[PDB]
């Protein structure tokens, strides 16, 4: 994974129960951006019609 | 995932389950206990009558909902008719005792 | 950039995360000094010594 | 009232009867086109009945009289 | 359409032919080139209907041109395809074959024919003949026959006798039987002999035959002659996308049976040898049995995948059957699933993301768009919502408004698992949840998923808003404490801001309002925690509903003044003048609710959450490594422990101390070291803050964040810091023993490899028990709620007689639950009066709210008669006044709701949390003796000569403070009525030596003491004071063992000294292990001895299961003298000789210690043998009240040990349903000893003793069962068939011909009607008045 700064301070209840509060900078610089590749299949058969 | 009106099973005609095939959540057995503990009979009646097991029930519900009339019409669950037919085919007689 | 609840440390019995946090801060401080002095290019031998 | 339903139950006497009476009122209020005797003040269909039963204008005993005078006068009009 | 009941019976061939629209002959199912079904196959469109709606096979009649004509080219009728789901078919079986359910289920034809099952099995397999009728007396009916002697009978008689094989023989046997002759014969011959081993079987025979008599159900239909077939739709052979097919194994079973059926049809007219016909008949029977139940009678018939085929019975039974996964619990529509996240939201608002909002309410969007006129047609609206134009959001913003949505979190343990929230649109993906409700859900924000449902009809919305809204749900149904207590961060902030620092800032400054205090704090001129003087105006409602204000000046911290902007004008200031811990916040919330109302409570809670979050953010608290302090004595304590550890090791290697003693010493010293380390830890952590303010030095409460999070109760406990910074105690290896080498280090200092390896034992075991026993918890919950189905309130007050006596739980130790809470919410059953006589507070019934409780606790009352659920006299339900007030609302329960389901959920939810010589008086009081046989010893003190005596500590008021147990033959250092202080050893007795102390005084000469036949001469080798030795049966001579060795008391003239005041002789009998202390010639005084006799979750599951303990305690059922009869024949025998009554004798184990002797007198329901007690015996001897008290106390002990509080009224209600069966002993309206329902017996006797008849009815006796048996043994059959063992209940209800009136909840749930609970009760009362009026 990545590594970044962290402070242990209860912020306005947004980390109420093990929740994570995140900053806009990490999204700006794409630290946790991932890539997913999927495959789709189209099949042609010879129906009696 | 979120389902409004989609596929239905073959033998019992209930909505399927699983996001990938677009099926609805299973209204499990314990929450039935909870809802009947609350005492909201109509809510569970809708849950097990007009949502999953009424071929001509959910259609009328959808029609009159589009018509702006949220009125409920009940019906005998299809999964109960399949049960009756199966237990009758097992060789044990079973009838619905009408008035 | 990351804010975490502090009350989740003691009862969860995981104290090593605090030591990891301190170690990471020390490592980043060393690297920060290295890059800060690198911007001015004092001496190759000075970097070697440090 | 709107977020709480305390004072309505005294006008009724039970928790399980208020839902029935509110539903019966709202049925004719919505599809019957009946003007609610409570002012509307920008409230939805299933809350004006609750407010009206909070102020206590309808009751099962008096919900069965104005629906009979109308039908008897309709029958008089036909005959 | 509307019906009243359900009918179940046997299927005669007549109606099985009537149902079918045709008969099948061809095993073929479908063509391969085309895909049209063949004629008279398993899919014949003629028999079952057209494949496509309103179409025929050829095309002559179609498109409703001919409505209901039959197409002559093919022979099919034109109609809808739904008829395929209802049309039935039959197959004519060439040879009759036996039903499997009525053959293997335990027999229903074995009893009916009174034959062993093995004989019937031999007959069915074509192995032995059976004589249907024999003309001669040599043979007889129902005599099994082997082939050789069968041929002998053939050659001897021939046609005179009639015998044969196969299911035809069984059918003929059933035909020949006459039911009325057996009915009149067995009933008469039953009374002639009291063979108790045969009474039950004869009664079962009579019941079965009489059920056959009055059911109109001929036994001839037991054997199948023509077999029905399932409609094609329920066994679909449908194409797959990949050009293949898939079908139910029912098709394979039907194919096999029809194939061998037509094979037998061919063989019958082929005139083949009878061996092949017998083989074919055998395989026909095997195939039909496999079809009905594959893996039941023989080897399970497997398919192509070598797996057993699912018979139609397997589709109707078990967890995978239609009952559980398709009837009770179903898939549902208009729902969604998401991940959970935290929110600033109000208590009644839930964050619903916009993307799912349009998907869920899409039909509503279509309707609103149609009514608004922006869409000409429905599909235009579909295109518009597909285009997500701004208009659809304009519709969404008000369509969702004032429309509640239900939220669910699997698993749903208790009633609070479903909550209705008002939706609030949010732009994201996850469901936003109000933090306060999380504790209600037992949900943590770590990826847990959440389900959202939407109600459609107006009644559903009204129910959701008025009943399911989170504001309505504050208190648990289990008990009345709140559920919305702030969990961890709000309490942290409150505990921080309501603090006192002696040297902070601006201390002593005098202020006149909270507003300027908050402006001072915001300006930073004054610290949050600083002592100041503030002017405060508070309010009280001392007047009859009016609030009056009082203004004053108080010394307080700044934060307590700031918090005053939140309290809703109705609480005293003292409630917000503390450190505000967890319990403080919870109790002040409860007080606010119980004083003001509901809406101010929720508003106050919301403002508390807001301010707590805000100030917690403002403060700032972190967990630094330096906060983990380590006391400097840790290594010193380690050394001062290992010193004597090595010393003990050296002592053990010396050999002067045993292994067990060494183990005990080392575990004790390690525990002492751990306690010292923990004490040092708490000393260093609780008052570590040393600060000075215009002085020298003062110690205050710690400012450590860890101390803040531990003391406030937000998370963790002070016991956890012990392993956080000190040694991690001692753990036990998985075998059960505890390792004597502890983990001396801690997490802060790190561990050794072997220390971590050792700790992993306990860690993995703890994970394992949690991972396993939750399944037992779920099964317990299911079994509990199954029996609690139909407990619903029907009346308000039945006007019953007295109920149950109530007492505190002072027994054993300290008073744990006083009378205050144990009766809070109950209703009395009699005119309870204050200790001052003729001062009555209740007219035999009142609602014991807090005020009456205060009035009674002010007085010295200790026992009250309260109305119980079990004592209710209401039929088919309970009345409110017999139950008590609600816990969810606080008022008296109104009719309509269901009590059984909520009680079962309440007692089943904590299941996952509960996986695992001398008497000293402690406090001053008067010593009282309960049921004492006092006597005076040789020293003049008071001693005891009975087992039924108890020690009581009476206070100055009169109520008992402490209770203790004193055994028989004990020595007391004090008498009765002694007012003594605590800390004195009052009662003394040897733990092993059980004396036979004599209550009277006189000469003691050895009588009935014959040496060499009953006793042995042994003398003490050190003291010399010894006498004749009496040993047990296994050690004494059998020559003199016939008579029990008795040592009577004599005098100078040699006569028995009788009991003072009674003419009964006074002599003692000596059992085994009795060595007489005094010699012959010497005597003893009163109170002196003659001979010295030396001496989790399943635990709550077995009680509801009513399991018999392994060594039940034997009690007496009648009073009188206890004597002994048969001796040492397998087991001893105990005779009872009462004053006038009968010889009650029974087996008694001589290997277990007794409480009385030959010369003693014992009353009924008394302890003769020791050990655990059986509830069945408790109910049989003592009344229902005793068993209710026993069950409630025993179950409450386990829940108390784990610190989980449950109101007792949620327990005996199950007991109320646990006691539902009765056994008759008299006659007049029923059988002799059959079991029935006690309420049925009550309604039977409600005319037999009333004006309808003088006296003909019978007397009954209550019976107690297991929870599962009680669940199965009900009037309805679907209720039992939907739970467990469906085959047995089905096959017994079929022969019994029962009908169910649809009274239970799950019955209507299955049938889809309104459930008779709440509004459903308001509908069923109308329906019942309708049916009463006809």
Swiss-Prot record, chain A:
Transmembrane segments: none annotated. Co-administration of salinamide and rifampicin or salinamide and myxopyronin suppresses the emergence of resistance to both antibiotics. Acetylated on several lysine residues in the presence of glucose. Coiled coil: none annotated. It comes from the Bacteria. DNA-dependent RNA polymerase (RNAP) catalyzes the transcription of DNA into RNA using the four ribonucleoside triphosphates as substrates. Belongs to the RNA polymerase beta chain family. The RNAP catalytic core consists of 2 alpha, 1 beta, 1 beta' and 1 omega subunit. When a sigma factor is associated with the core the holoenzyme is formed, which can initiate transcription. The rRNA transcription and antitermination complex (rrnTAC) consists of RNAP, NusA, NusB, NusE (rpsJ), NusG, SubB, ribosomal protein S4, DNA and precursor rRNA; S4 is more flexible than other subunits. In pull-down experiments interacts with CedA. (Microbial infection) Interacts (via flap domain) with Escherichia phage lambda antitermination protein Q; this interaction renders bacterial RNAP resistant to transcription pausing and allows it to read through termination signals. This is DNA-directed RNA polymerase subunit beta. It comes from Escherichia coli (strain K12). The lineage of its organism: Bacteria, Pseudomonadati, Pseudomonadota, Gammaproteobacteria, Enterobacterales.
From Swiss-Prot, chain D:
SUPFAM superfamilies: RPB6/omega subunit-like. One of its GO terms (biological process) is protein-containing complex assembly. Keywords: DNA-directed RNA polymerase, Nucleotidyltransferase, Transcription, Transferase. One of its GO terms (molecular function) is bacterial-type RNA polymerase core enzyme binding. It comes from the Bacteria. GO terms for cellular component: cytosol; cytosolic DNA-directed RNA polymerase complex; RNA polymerase complex; transcription elongation factor complex. Its EC number is 2.7.7.6. Pfam families: RNA_pol_Rpb6. It is an enzyme of class 2 (transferase). The keyword Transferase applies. InterPro entries: DNA-dir_RNA_pol_omega (IPR003716), Pol_omega/Rpo6/RPB6 (IPR006110), RPB6/omega-like_sf (IPR036161). NCBIfam families: rpoZ (TIGR00690). The RNAP catalytic core consists of 2 alpha, 1 beta, 1 beta' and 1 omega subunit. When a sigma factor is associated with the core the holoenzyme is formed, which can initiate transcription. The rRNA transcription and antitermination complex (rrnTAC) consists of RNAP, NusA, NusB, NusE (rpsJ), NusG, SubB, ribosomal protein S4, DNA and precursor rRNA; S4 is more flexible than other subunits. Promotes RNA polymerase (RNAP) assembly. Latches the N- and C-terminal regions of the beta' subunit thereby facilitating its interaction with the beta and alpha subunits. PANTHER family: DNA-DIRECTED RNA POLYMERASE SUBUNIT OMEGA. HAMAP family: RNApol_bact_RpoZ (MF_00366). Belongs to the RNA polymerase subunit omega family. This is DNA-directed RNA polymerase subunit omega.
Swiss-Prot record, chain E:
Changing residue 766 to A/C: Resistant to antibiotics salinamide A and B. The keyword Cell division does not apply. One of its GO terms (molecular function) is DNA binding. The modification N6-acetyllysine is found at residue 952. The keyword Repeat does not apply. One of its GO terms (biological process) is cell motility. Zn(2+) 2 binds at residues 798, 872, 879, 882. Disulfide bonds: none annotated. Co-administration of salinamide and rifampicin or salinamide and myxopyronin suppresses the emergence of resistance to both antibiotics. Changing residue 763 to T/V: Resistant to antibiotics salinamide A and B. Changing residue 722 to C/H/P/S: Resistant to antibiotics salinamide A and B. Zn(2+) 1 binds at residues 56, 58, 71, 74. Its EC number is 2.7.7.6. Changing residue 681 to V: Resistant to antibiotics salinamide A and B. Keywords: Acetylation, Antibiotic resistance, DNA-directed RNA polymerase, Magnesium, Metal-binding, Nucleotidyltransferase, Transcription, Transferase, Zinc. Its cofactor is Mg(2+); Zn(2+). The RNAP catalytic core consists of 2 alpha, 1 beta, 1 beta' and 1 omega subunit. When a sigma factor is associated with the core the holoenzyme is formed, which can initiate transcription. The rRNA transcription and antitermination complex (rrnTAC) consists of RNAP, NusA, NusB, NusE (rpsJ), NusG, SubB, ribosomal protein S4, DNA and precursor rRNA; S4 is more flexible than other subunits. Belongs to the RNA polymerase beta' chain family. PANTHER family: DNA-DIRECTED RNA POLYMERASE, DNA-DIRECTED RNA POLYMERASE SUBUNIT BETA. This is DNA-directed RNA polymerase subunit beta'. It comes from Escherichia coli (strain K12).
